[PDB]
C-alpha cells in the first residue's frame, strides 16, 4: 500500500530539485545533457543520477530518501545471547521478583565464565537488548478506554446481563 514521504532532509530536497528539473519531457538527444546539467549540481557522476532516477521510479520520493540498513535494531551478540539475556530477565520478573538488567548482566558474566566463554556481553548491550521489552511492558500502563458515547447506555452486570439504562 501507499508509502508517503515526510520530513525530507535538505539533501533529499536537492535530490527533489534535480528530479523536478528532469521531469521536463526529454529524449536521448535531450536526456544526456539535461541529466549532465543536473549531475554537475549533484556534483557526482552520471550513473548515480541513473540509479537516483531508477529508485525514484521504483519507489517515488521514498526511493530518493535513504532507508536505514537492514541491520538497524538487530544485535550482533547473536541468537544464543539475545535469548539468554531475554530469558533471564523474563524469569526474573514473574512473581514478585524484580530482577533489573544489571542483575541479568551479572548473570551473563557468571554464565560466560561457566560456559568458558571469554567475551561476555557488556551491560550496555544488555540494557539495549531489554530497552524495547521494557518499553512494551511500559506501554501497557497507558492504553486508554474509549468510553460510552451519546445518550445510549448500559451497565455490565456480573450476571453477564447488560442492563440498559
Amino acid at each position: 500500500k501507499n508509502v508517503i514521504a515526510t520530513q525530507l532532509s535538505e539533501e533529499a530536497q536537492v535530490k527533489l530539485e534535480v528530479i523536478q528539473s528532469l521531469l521536463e519531457p526529454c529524449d536521448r538527444t535531450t536526456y544526456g545533457q539535461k541529466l549532465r546539467e543536473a549531475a554537475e549540481k549533484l556534483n557526482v557522476s552520471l550513473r548515480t543520477v541513473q540509479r537516483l532516477v531508477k529508485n525514484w521510479e521504483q519507489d517515488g520520493l521514498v526511493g530518493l530518501t535513504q532507508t536505514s540498513r537492514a541491520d538497524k535494531g538487530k544485535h550482533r551478540i547473536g541468537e544464543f545471547w539475545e535469548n539468554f539475556i531475554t530469558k533471564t530477565y523474563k524469569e526474573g520478573n514473574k512473581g514478585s521478583k524484580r530482577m533489573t538488567p544489571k542483575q541479568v548482566a551479572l548473570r551473563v558474566e557468571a554464565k560466560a565464565r561457566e560456559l568458558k566463554d571469554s567475551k561476555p556481553p557488556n551491560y550496555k548491550t544488555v540494557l539495549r537488548v531489554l530497552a524495547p521489552i521494557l518499553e512494551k511492558q511500559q506501554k501497557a500502563k497507558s492504553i486508554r478506554s474509549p468510553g460510552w458515547r451519546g445518550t445510549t447506555l448500559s451497565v455490565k452486570t456480573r450476571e453477564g446481563k447488560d442492563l440498559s439504562v
Binding site: 500500500k1 501507499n2 508509502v3 508517503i4 514521504a5 515526510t6 520530513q7 525530507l8 532532509s9 527533489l16 528530479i19 523536478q20 521531469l23 521536463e24 519531457p25 517515488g60 520520493l61 521514498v62 530518501t65 535513504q66 532507508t67 536505514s68 506501554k139 501497557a140 497507558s142 492504553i143 486508554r144 478506554s145 474509549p146 458515547r149 451519546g150
Partner: protein, 297 residues
C-alpha cells in the same frame, strides 16, 4: 499543443454568504477550479471557507484525477467522467511541487466571471443568506457540468468545451488508483489509538479494521473536507508514513458528513455549553473560602 497538456488552476472568492444548519451565519467561500488550457472544460473543483493556500488546490487536483463518482442528491443528468493523470499544471508554499513530482507531472506555478455574469451571482445573500454549503456542493456540480461545461464554447463555438476536451485527449483519459493519491489529502497528526483500535476526530469517534493491534500507539490521519465518514490512518516512521487502514465514523446519524458539519455540530454543542450560567457554581467558591478562613488549628 493538444488539450489536456497544461491544466490551469484558478481561485476566486464567492460573493454569496451562507447560513449554517442551526442558523449561524457562515462566511463567503473561496472557489478553486481545475480547467483545461486548450479546452475550456472544467475538470476539478473545490469550494469552502478554507483560504486559497496550498490546501484547496491540493484537493482540487485530487478531485480531477480520480473517477468522478457522484450522488443521487445532485440530480445530475451527465456523468462528468473526467478522469486522467495530468502532465502539466499551473497555479498562482512549496507543497504543490512534491505532489507534482510524486505524481510525475511538471508543476510550473507562478474566467470565473462567467459565473459572475450568470444568475449564480443572484441567489439569496448575493453580493437573506438562505442557503448552505452542502446545497452549493450539490447544485454547483450540476450547474457547472450540465450547463456551464456541456454547452458550446464562447469562441471556437463549433464544439462544446467538454467534447472538445474529450476527443482531444491524445489517446483516452486513464484513471489511476485511489490510495496512491493520499498525498493530496488534508493531514492531522499524533492522534492516539485507544482500546480496540479507536480514535477521536472532530468530536466524533472512529474505529479501524486492524487498528486494535496498535492501541496505545499514535497515528496520523488524512481526510477530505467533503466526507469525513471514513478517514485514512497511517503509522508514522522516521522518514516514511505507511498507510495502515481505513477507520469508520461511528454513532453519526447520517450516511454522509462534511467537515463543515462536524464543525457545526461542535459549534452548536460548544455554544450550548457557553450559555449555562455559573452563578451558583461560582458564588459557592468564594463562600467555601470565607468559611475556611475561620479555621485555626
Amino acid at each position: 499543443d493538444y488539450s489536456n497538456h497544461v491544466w490551469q488552476c484558478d481561485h476566486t472568492r464567492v460573493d454569496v454568504l451562507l447560513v449554517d444548519q442551526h442558523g449561524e451565519i457562515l462566511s463567503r467561500p473561496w472557489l478553486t477550479t481545475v480547467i483545461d488550457t486548450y479546452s475550456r472544460c472544467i475538470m476539478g473543483i473545490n469550494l469552502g471557507f478554507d483560504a486559497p493556500s496550498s490546501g484547496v488546490v491540493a484537493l482540487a487536483l485530487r478531485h480531477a484525477i480520480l473517477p468522478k463518482r457522484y450522488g443521487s442528491e445532485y440530480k445530475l443528468h451527465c456523468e462528468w467522467g473526467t478522469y486522467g493523470k495530468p502532465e502539466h499544471f499551473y497555479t498562482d508554499s512549496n507543497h504543490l511541487s512534491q505532489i507534482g513530482a510524486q505524481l510525475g507531472f511538471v508543476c510550473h506555478l507562478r474566467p470565473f466571471k462567467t459565473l459572475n455574469d450568470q444568475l449564480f451571482s443572484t441567489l439569496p445573500g448575493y453580493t437573506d443568506a438562505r442557503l448552505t454549503l452542502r446545497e452549493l456542493e450539490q447544485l454547483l456540480v450540476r450547474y457547472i457540468v450540465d450547463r456551464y461545461n456541456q454547452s458550446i464554447d464562447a469562441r471556437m463555438g463549433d464544439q462544446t468545451r467538454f467534447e472538445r476536451w474529450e476527443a482531444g485527449l491524445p489517446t483516452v483519459p486513464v484513471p489511476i488508483p485511489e490510495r496512491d493519491l493520499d498525498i493530496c489529502l488534508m493531514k492531522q497528526s499524533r492522534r492516539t489509538v485507544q482500546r480496540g483500535g479507536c480514535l477521536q476526530f472532530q468530536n466524533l469517534m472512529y474505529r479501524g479494521e486492524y487498528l486494535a493491534g496498535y492501541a496505545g500507539e499514535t497515528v496520523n490521519l488524512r481526510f477530505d473536507p467533503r466526507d469525513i465518514t471514513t478517514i485514512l490512518v497511517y503509522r508514522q516512521e522516521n522518514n516514511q508514513e505507511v498507510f495502515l487502514t481505513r477507520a469508520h465514523a461511528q454513532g453519526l446519524e447520517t450516511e454522509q458528513l462534511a467537515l463543515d458539519e462536524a464543525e457545526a455540530a461542535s459549534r452548536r454543542l460548544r455554544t450550548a455549553g457557553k450559555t449555562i450560567s455559573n452563578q451558583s457554581l461560582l458564588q459557592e467558591v468564594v463562600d467555601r473560602d470565607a468559611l475556611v478562613a475561620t479555621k485555626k488549628s
